[PDB]
């Protein structure tokens, strides 16, 4: 299941993934809370994202 970013997000920690609205993301892990570990299919980068900034596709 891929997700699409609904907003831009600028990294706020060294472990975050920055992304732009419309980027497509794969969830690597969502077991730890509302911050999900994701991989950008667009940019190739990996990191945590706020789960309320994305929607399923």
């Amino acid at each position: 299941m891929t997700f699409v970013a609904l907003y831009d997000y600028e990294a706020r920690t060294e472990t975050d993934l920055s992304f732009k609205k419309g980027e497509r993301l794969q969830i690597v892990n969502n077991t730890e809370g509302d911050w999900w570990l994701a991989h950008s299919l667009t940019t190739g980068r990996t990191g945590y994202i706020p789960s309320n900034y994305v929607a399923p596709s």
Binding site: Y7, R12, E32, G33, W35, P50, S51, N52, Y53
Partner: peptide, 10 residues
């Protein structure tokens, strides 16, 4: 934009 969630707890 929505408020950010609290950071994950262990």
């Amino acid at each position: 934009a929505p408020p950010l969630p609290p950071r994950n707890r262990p």
